[PDB]
UniProtKB/TrEMBL annotation, chain D:
Location(s), subcellular: Cell membrane; Membrane
Domain ATPase F1/V1/A1 complex alpha/beta subunit N-terminal: 23-70
Role noted for this protein: Produces ATP from ADP in the presence of a proton gradient across the membrane. The alpha chain is a regulatory subunit.
Residues of the full protein shown: 3 to 72 of 502
Gene: uncA
Name of the protein this chain belongs to: ATP synthase subunit alpha
Similarity field: Belongs to the ATPase alpha/beta chains family.
Classification lineage: Bacteria, Bacillati, Bacillota, Bacilli, Bacillales
Amino acid sequence: NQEVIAKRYASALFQIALEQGQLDRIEEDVRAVRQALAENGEFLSLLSYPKLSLDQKKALIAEAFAGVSTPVQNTLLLLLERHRFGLVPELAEQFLALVDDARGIAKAVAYSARPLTDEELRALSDVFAQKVGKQTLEIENIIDPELIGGVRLRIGNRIYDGSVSGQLERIRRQL
Amino acid sequence: IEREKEQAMAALREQVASLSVLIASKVIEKELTEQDQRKLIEAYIKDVQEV
Amino acid sequence: ISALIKQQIENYESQIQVSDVGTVIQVGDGIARAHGLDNVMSGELVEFANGVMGMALNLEENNVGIVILGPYTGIKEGDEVRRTGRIMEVPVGEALIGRVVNPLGQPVDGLGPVETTETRPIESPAPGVMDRRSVHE
Amino acid sequence: IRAEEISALIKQQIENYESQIQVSDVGTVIQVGDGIARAHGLDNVMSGELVEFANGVMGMALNLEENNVG
């Protein structure tokens, strides 16, 4: 139930970021806030503590997040007043997921046994960006050597496995 | 016994198939990765383009 | 058996394939929820990682209620659930006659495979009102 | 970038209020009613534990939920 409530907040912040026309200053700041809240987990236990009054928690956010953008600060101060500060990293991650649909960029993860050169990465990125419909495509490589001399590509929830799947389909079709 | 016999034969192909796949992978693994990895990427990219 | 295996190895051609995968989040007493699977249909065979099948009944806003069609004790949180792409169907033909079969269409008496050519979906519409005839024989 | 500065600010904010995180042995009540209390705090309670309030009225901790103690 938590992810759809994060999605509501992220879609509201996405609509106000698309309406205000300050999209990059919102996006990089929410990325920095998500990194800072993934760095330390004791800040949620600090803001869940009952003897601190709501004005002290609001001043604590306004002091600790003094450099953030104004719609992001208003969003987090609404999240504090709703007892929803335990829901902020998921909505930050879903906000960065939804802003890349506006940019058109998709994030792909490629499991390769050998580290691939950048020219083939750019070629497959342009090819599957023309296939999937993206303007450009971001490729994240891994150094897992379990693949049999190949690369398997993950485009969201639809994967392109061609490394050990040949031998797997061979021993499946043999029996 | 006749049915069973067909099953014993099938089971037998299968036990052996199982061993065969594990070695085929080990021989495959043993083969080069320099030039062959360059081919596989090139080929992978070509393949995706056909698909 | 070696000649048929060599003919199958010479006939088969290697290729890449899609899966339309999703990851499990809850596994409990015969039923799994899962993220992903964004183009899954209501009521289809959805295949887990260890080969156990499962039917997708509840499609919800961010998860799929997959009902596990086998032993679920090998299924954990984080397993990959790939999409087959076909509504629930049983292999139906003349070869089923005289033979004991589980509701997924697989032979359970242990006499070999069931050799049927064409399949039929399990939930198909009934014969209509004008298609009937009064019962007389 | 700015994320390291924000992390340093929130770490200094945690370290400033570190004396009020005495939470590990005491608790503050959230809900009071009908012979039931929910207390935020009390990290080291046992289940079924005898628990005294500020009045000296005794209480028993039955449900040890994730963020409160019933």
